[PDB]
Design a protein around this ligand. Sequence first.
Ligand code: NA
Length: 95
Amino acid sequence: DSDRFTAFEEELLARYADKGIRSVDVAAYAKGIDIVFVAADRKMTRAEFSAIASRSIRELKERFGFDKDVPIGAVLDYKKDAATDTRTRFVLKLR
Ligand code: NA
């Protein structure tokens, strides 16, 4: 149960590691689900992130069977390392 999304997260991490992504988390709450990406840099444009997020959300929905009425969004954070506080770059609104 705790590991429901782990394999999926690991797959996405491995796919986007070359783009500075260091962690991926499927974060579910009452009103929606977000895929939370953490990068070690600020190089990705919004348009680039938006494409990565859109594909990951499509994949999430198909893989876990999330109905069309389940809002899903995505977040890109910049966290350089464990010595540095998180800064959020983009939040794509639950669609
Ligand atoms: Na993770």
